[PDB]
Ligand binder design. Structure first.
Ligand SMILES: *[C@@H]1O[C@H](CO)[C@@H](O[C@@H]2O[C@H](CO)[C@@H](O)[C@H](O)[C@H]2NC(C)=O)[C@H](O)[C@H]1NC(C)=O
Ligand code: UDP
Ligand code: NGA
Ligand code: NAG
Ligand code: NAG
Ligand code: MN
Length: 536
């Protein structure tokens, strides 16, 4: 019998809505010079002074899709073991995670909450934590005998879980309203599906709660294996935008997976060290070996992204080794695409993978080719295994002032000023960066077309100066056009690039294929590409 149910705790929603105080409803914390010190970050990578001044039960805004409130799920669902690994995690941030789980998860559906201590040295994580958690029956603390790392530490928790499905959560999260039922329901219908809630951001400074940019998006990666998020192609967008949707890769820290299914895949590669790579291993595993992976818009959990890594990592440990172990076992021929960018990965021992490779074959999995072609088919659109050639690169000299486009190596956000051309015959004492590349993405970024920087030419209005704002693979305000009239057309602003003849900064203005201050010249080119997106 599929007797459904409305798992919403209307009263709790009312009481949470009626809650008042600093940080309530997810609003930012009223920052003061006291909380703005640098010692407030030293321990966690996020503001612990602010965290301490916010209630461990603070309320959060319900930013779910309007349809989510209407959804209903199976009256009978499988119970879950919530595993939370931690290492020298802050006191309040950890307690807020557990409270959110306790107060926003139907007790009946929670078999147990297991906090797994990864050899923590912070004192508040010892007796105090124990006495405090002893007051909550469903909570249990498990400790490793030495530093094991998040991967193995999550494995420890998984090896003891008694619930039907294992739900993983980082130690600095905050479950939002009615987040668990929609995850359990999905796995109840498809045991081999791994599910991920939408991961929302909890600001490391004022702790405000808000969705990541772009909201519902597909997971992916660049060829250096940095996690990326790309938009859902129109042909994949569900009728009801609140419905479960496929994701090729998970962020890694928040997901639920049937316990039995989890071990059938072999959990995680025990060889993965402190951080990195397990998200790729497990994601490739679920798809390639018979399962699936889905993001559940109706389930949302806040997560605090660190401003920097506080803990320490043992000697002789790098992300490279983890990644290498993942590439060799599951990435087939695509692993090569990784080495062509990071050559040290070739003659770099990835340890013994024999055991792992044995796992893959015993599962009868598809090729990684299959994964790239049928699952992550949109990934190469933003991160092509082999990047198309650039249109133009070199120095950008303005016909008018005769000067060159330069930048005082201002990576943050210093306008694209104008300086006397160096041409490689200059002194590095004056700090001259006059090399640029008009990449295949129709954007302009400093450096050689082979050693470009993640900084693009971003312009707001049709008069503001150019900027080296972070590059976002979107033809937004980083979309340029180099026409035969020697001008850098900005379609999203309808204006062109100009510069004050009085030897001043470079700023947008009214286009004019007759002016000299708007006429630019690159050192090299490839008209075959300049004829690409210049016509409709
Ligand atoms: C904040 O959350 C905690 C953790 O759930 C609350 O403490 C528990 O509240 C429930 C009520 O649903 C009781 O059944 C438990 O016995 C409480 N735990 C213990 C041992 O005290 C706490 O009351 C909440 N505080 C606020 C602001 O409501
Ligand atoms: O050696 C480690 C490092 C991290 N963690 C925990 O694993 C989770 C994920 O790590 P982290 O938050 O540092 O990764 P991030 O989200 O920043 O990428 C957190 O709960 C950490 O406390 C752990 O148990 N052992
Ligand atoms: C919010 C989130 O998913 N964080 C994860 C982190 O928990 C860990 O899995 C890391 C790889 O070690 O990847 C991150 O993206
Ligand atoms: C531009 O020139 C390069 C030579 O480096 C060539 O390989 C490329 O095909 C040209 N542009 C395109 C994509 O046609
Ligand atoms: C959850 O219920 C299942 C039976 O459906 C049982 O196997 C499991 O042990 C329960 N979890 C708890 C509370 O131990
Ligand atoms: Mn984290």
């Amino acid at each position: 019998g599929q007797k459904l149910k409305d798992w919403h705790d209307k009263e709790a929603i009312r009481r949470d809505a009626q809650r008042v105080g600093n940080g309530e409803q997810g609003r930012p914390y009223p920052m003061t010079d006291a909380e703005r010190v640098d010692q407030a970050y030293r321990e966690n990578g996020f503001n612990i002074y602010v965290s301490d001044k916010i209630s461990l039960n603070r309320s959060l805004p319900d930013i779910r899709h309007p349809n989510c409130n209407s959804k209903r799920y199976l009256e009978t669902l499988p119970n879950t073991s919530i595993i939370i690994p931690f290492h020298n995690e802050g006191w309040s941030s950890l307690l807020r995670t557990v409270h959110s789980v306790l107060n926003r998860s139907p007790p009946e559906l929670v078999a147990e909450i297991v906090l797994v201590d990864d050899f923590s040295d912070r004192e508040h994580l010892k007796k105090p934590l124990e006495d405090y958690m002893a007051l909550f029956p469903s909570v249990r603390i498990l400790r490793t005998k030495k530093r094991e790392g998040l991967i193995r530490t999550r494995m420890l928790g998984a090896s003891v879980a008694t619930g039907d499905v294992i739900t993983f959560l980082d130690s600095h999260c905050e479950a939002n309203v009615n987040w668990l039922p929609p995850l359990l329901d999905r796995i109840a219908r498809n045991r081999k599906t791994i599910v991920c809630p939408m991961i929302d951001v909890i600001d490391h400074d004022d702790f405000r709660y808000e969705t990541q940019a772009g909201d519902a998006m597909r997971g992916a990666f660049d060829w250096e294996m940095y996690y990326k998020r790309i938009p859902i192609p129109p042909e994949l967008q569900k009728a009801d935008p609140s419905d479960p949707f496929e994701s090729p890769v998970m962020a890694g820290g928040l997901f639920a997976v049937d316990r039995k299914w989890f071990w059938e895949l072999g959990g995680y590669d025990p060889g993965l060290e402190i951080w990195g790579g397990e998200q790729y291993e497990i994601s490739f595993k679920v798809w390639m070996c018979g399962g699936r992976m889905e993001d559940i818009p109706c389930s949302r959990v806040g997560h605090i992204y660190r401003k920097y890594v506080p803990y320490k990592v043992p000697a002789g440990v790098s992300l490279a080794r983890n990644l290498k172990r993942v590439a060799e076992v599951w990435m087939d021929e695509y692993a090569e695409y990784i080495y062509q960018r990071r050559p040290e990965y070739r003659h770099l021992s990835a340890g013994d993978v024999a055991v792992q490779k044995k796992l893959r074959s015993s599962l009868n999995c598809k090729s990684f080719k299959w994964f790239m072609t049928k699952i992550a088919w949109d990934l190469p659109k933003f991160y092509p295994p082999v990047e198309p050639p650039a249109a133009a690169w070199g120095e950008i000299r303005n016909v008018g002032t005769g000067l060159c486009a330069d930048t005082k190596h201002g990576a943050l956000g210093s306008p694209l000023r104008l300086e006397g051309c160096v041409r490689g015959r200059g002194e590095a004492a004056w700090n001259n960066m006059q090399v640029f590349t008009f990449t295949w993405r129709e954007d302009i970024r400093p450096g050689d077309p082979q050693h470009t920087k993640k900084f693009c030419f971003d312009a707001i209005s049709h008069t503001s100066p150019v900027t080296l704002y972070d590059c976002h693979s979107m033809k937004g305000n980083q979309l340029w056009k180099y026409r035969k009239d020697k001008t850098l057309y900005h379609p999203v602003s309808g204006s062109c690039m100009d510069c004050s003849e009085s030897d001043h900064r470079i700023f947008m203005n009214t286009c004019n294929p007759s002016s000299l201050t708007q006429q630019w010249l690159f050192e090299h080119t490839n008209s075959t590409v300049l004829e690409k997106f210049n016509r409709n």
